[PDB]
Amino acid sequence: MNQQKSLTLIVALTTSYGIGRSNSLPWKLKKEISYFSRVTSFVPTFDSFESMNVVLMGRKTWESIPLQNRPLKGRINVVITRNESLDLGNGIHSAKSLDHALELLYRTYGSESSVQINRIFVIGGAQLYKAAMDHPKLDRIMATIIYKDIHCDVFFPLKFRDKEWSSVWKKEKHSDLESWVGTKVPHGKINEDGFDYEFEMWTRDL
Ligand SMILES: NC(=O)C1=CN([C@@H]2O[C@H](COP(=O)(O)OP(=O)(O)OC[C@H]3O[C@@H](n4cnc5c(N)ncnc54)[C@H](OP(=O)(O)O)[C@@H]3O)[C@@H](O)[C@H]2O)C=CC1
Numbered sequence: 001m002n003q004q005k006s007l008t009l010i011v012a013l014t015t016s017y018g019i020g021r022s023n024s025l026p027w028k029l030k031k032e033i034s035y036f037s038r039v040t041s042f043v044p045t046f047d048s049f050e051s052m053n054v055v056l057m058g059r060k061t062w063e064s065i066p067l068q069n070r071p072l073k074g075r076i077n078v079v080i081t082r083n084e085s086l087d088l089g090n091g092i093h094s095a096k097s098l099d100h101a102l103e104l105l106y107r108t109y110g111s112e113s114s115v116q117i118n119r120i121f122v123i124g125g126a127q128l129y130k131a132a133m134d135h136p137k138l139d140r141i142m143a144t145i146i147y148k149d150i151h152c153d154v155f156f157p158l159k160f161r162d163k164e165w166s167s168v169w170k171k172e173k174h175s176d177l178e179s180w181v182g183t184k185v186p187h188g189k190i191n192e193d194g195f196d197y198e199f200e201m202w203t204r205d206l
C-alpha cells in the first residue's frame, strides 16, 4: 500500500546540467525561488483545508538551506540519509531511502490523520536526484533551465533534455505546465541578475 502516487522532481539547472556549488546554489535568483516555493506549496483550493505537499531532500541539501528557512515552510519536509543520526528536528522526518520515506509518509499521514498528503516532490541532492530518476514512480520534471555555463561542482545525474533520452522524456506545452501547477506562469526567458532562465515541464510515461 505504497505505489499509488507518482513523484515529481523539481530542479534548476544550467545547459551543462550544473546544479550546485560549494554546497549551495551557484546563482541567487529570488523569483526562481518564488516559483520553487509556489510549485512545491500549491494545493487545489478544495483540498488545502487539510492537504499539504511533501519535499524530500538529501541531507547535504538540507544542510545547504539557510537555518532561517528550515524546515521549508508550509510543506512536509523529509530528509534522506544513510546515517540515522540527528538533524535536531522541529518535526524533522528522516529516512534511509526514497522508499523508506514513502512508507514513513503513508504511515504518518494515513487516510485517517489530520494532515493529508497532496503531492510529493523530490527537491534535490544530485545523489537523491539519481535515486529519483531510477524510481519507477517518478514521472515529471519541473525544470528551470538556466542559459549560462555557470561554474558548478555538482551536476544533475541524468541528461534528460538530451537526444539519447528524448524517447523517454518529452517537454510539455506551456499551458500544460500552467494547469498542473495551477497558476499563470511566465513563458519564455526571464532575466534576473545577468542570466536568462525559463520554466519547463517534462514527463515520462510510467
Ligand atoms: N535545483 C537546484 O539547483 C538544486 C541544487 N542543489 C545543490 O545540490 C548540491 C548537493 O547535492 P549532493 O551533494 O548530491 O547532495 P544531496 O542533497 O543529494 O545529499 C547527499 C547525501 O544525502 C543522502 N542521500 C542521497 N541520496 C540517498 C539515497 N538514495 N539513499 C540514502 N541516502 C541518500 C546521503 O546522506 P548521508 O551521507 O547522511 O548517508 C548522501 O550522502 C548542493 O550544491 C546544493 O546546493 C540542491 C537542491 C536543488
Ligand SMILES: CN(c1ccccc1)c1cnc2nc(N)nc(N)c2c1
Residues within 6 Å of the ligand: 010, 011, 012, 025, 032, 033, 036, 061, 064, 065, 066, 069, 122, 123, 124, 142, 143, 144
Ligand atoms: C535547495 N533550494 C533552496 C530552497 C530554499 C532556500 C535555499 C535553497 C532550492 C532552491 N531553488 C530551487 N529551484 C528549483 N527549481 N528546484 C529546487 N529543488 C530548488 C531548490
